[PDB]
Amino acid sequence: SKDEEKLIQSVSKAVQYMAKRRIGALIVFEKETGLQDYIETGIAMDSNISQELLINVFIPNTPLHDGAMIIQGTKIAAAASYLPLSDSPKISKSGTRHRAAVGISEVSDAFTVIVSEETGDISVTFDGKLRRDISNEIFEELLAEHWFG
Amino acid sequence: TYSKDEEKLIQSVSKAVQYMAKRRIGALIVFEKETGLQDYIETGIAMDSNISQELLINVFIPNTPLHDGAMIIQGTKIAAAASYLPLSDSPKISKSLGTRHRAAVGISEVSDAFTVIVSEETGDISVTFDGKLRRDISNEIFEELLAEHWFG
Ligand SMILES: Nc1ncnc2c1ncn2[C@@H]1O[C@H](COP(=O)(O)CP(=O)(O)OP(=O)(O)O)[C@@H](O)[C@H]1O
Ligand SMILES: Nc1ncnc2c1ncn2[C@@H]1O[C@H](COP(=O)(O)CP(=O)(O)OP(=O)(O)O)[C@@H](O)[C@H]1O
Ligand SMILES: [Mn+2]
């Protein structure tokens, strides 16, 4: 819908911004698995969403950059939350934010996007499986589909 | 005298303003009284967020989109960031002063809002209300003024 696409653009434009600037980011989009347990380990925001706020949160050396940001519907549920970590061998040993995204994907049906601190690649995790280095067009397609759809 | 959650907030704000004072990070926070600032809210970015010391710090970090302009609070929620306020033209304002000070004042003039400013250059905490700017208040005085202007 017309309003849903503004949010996809807001999110998609923020991760592209952080991709080029090499800012690591970890954003969880809640489906039907309740993530209120993982929200409560972070800082509550209950915030509306905007490309500018998404970028501010993940600025390095800031309080909210540490941990995952959790989205519930149209609002920022929390920032700086910690997700559990998977120990599966398929994970390449070459980041923790990648560990956290797979972790939450094994324990929930959430859709998580990761931007790599070192490479700037856009990766996603859902259904316990990591999808690495996807293009922006592919990312918007998947985000639209898992987030609303 | 004040509710436990009400005191949660002050502290939150108070710890955020102190952190930014020592680091010389400029900040501008407007607390809405009864004059509606929705016109000034609409010039920023909407947030409608809850308050925490950590978010207040993130907003005003230099070189970020949300740092330039004012943060406007309505009750318990951050209404918007990067809002712009009118600039005072009073002759008494010192040429030495920053735009934001100029701004706070301005806002003071046309509304009954309570505005706090931390100067990038000195780290001094100043507050604004009723067209009057009171410079360099101490942290203890700031919590007193904020509590009474914010929650009456
Ligand atoms: N429980 C948890 N759940 C989710 N994310 C976490 C987490 N603990 C830490 N993080 C994220 O992990 C990031 C830091 O990871 P680090 O301790 O620097 C190992 P790293 O990610 O491999 O660094 P690198 O990516 O540069 O190699 C933090 O910035 C935080 O965002
Ligand atoms: N109308 C307004 N309302 C609120 N804040 C304002 C404002 N106009 C400017 N500011 C604040 O003023 C600060 C910049 O001070 P200025 O006097 O404008 C030097 P500047 O060139 O604008 O700094 P810049 O280097 O960020 O451009 C900005 O952080 C912004 O926060
Ligand atoms: Mn200037």
Closest-CA residue to B133 (of B102, B98, B91): B102
Q: What residues contact A142, with CB distance under 8 A and at least 6 apart? A: A111, A124, A131, A134
Nearest-angstrom CA–CA distance, B58 and A9: 22
Which residues of chain A lie closer than 8 angstroms to B45, CB-CB? 50, 52-53
Find the helix packing angle between B4-22 and B139-151, rounded to 10°. 140
* Bridge-based pairing state of the strands B45-50 and B27-31: unpaired
* Lookup result for tokens 């700037």: A120
B71 CB within 6 A, ligand 2: no
Which residues of chain A lie closer than 8 angstroms to B64, CB-CB? 55-56, 59
Nearest-angstrom CA–CA distance, A147 and A116: 21
- PDB resolution in Å: 2.6
- Structural domain containing residue A37: 1-149
CA angle A133, A6, A134 (to 5 degrees): 5
Distance of CA A38 to the CA centre of its chain: 13
Question: What is the tally of structural domains in chain A?
Answer: 1
Element at A101 (helix H, strand E): helix A96-107
Closest partner residue to A47 (CB to CB) among B49, B61, B64 is B49
* Bridge-based pairing state of the strands B70-74 and B27-31: parallel
Element at B82 (helix H, strand E): strand B77-83
Domain of B130, CATH number, reads 3.40.1700.10
State the first-to-last Cα distance of chain B, in angstroms, to the nearest integer: 11
* Bridge-based pairing state of the strands A25-29 and A68-72: parallel
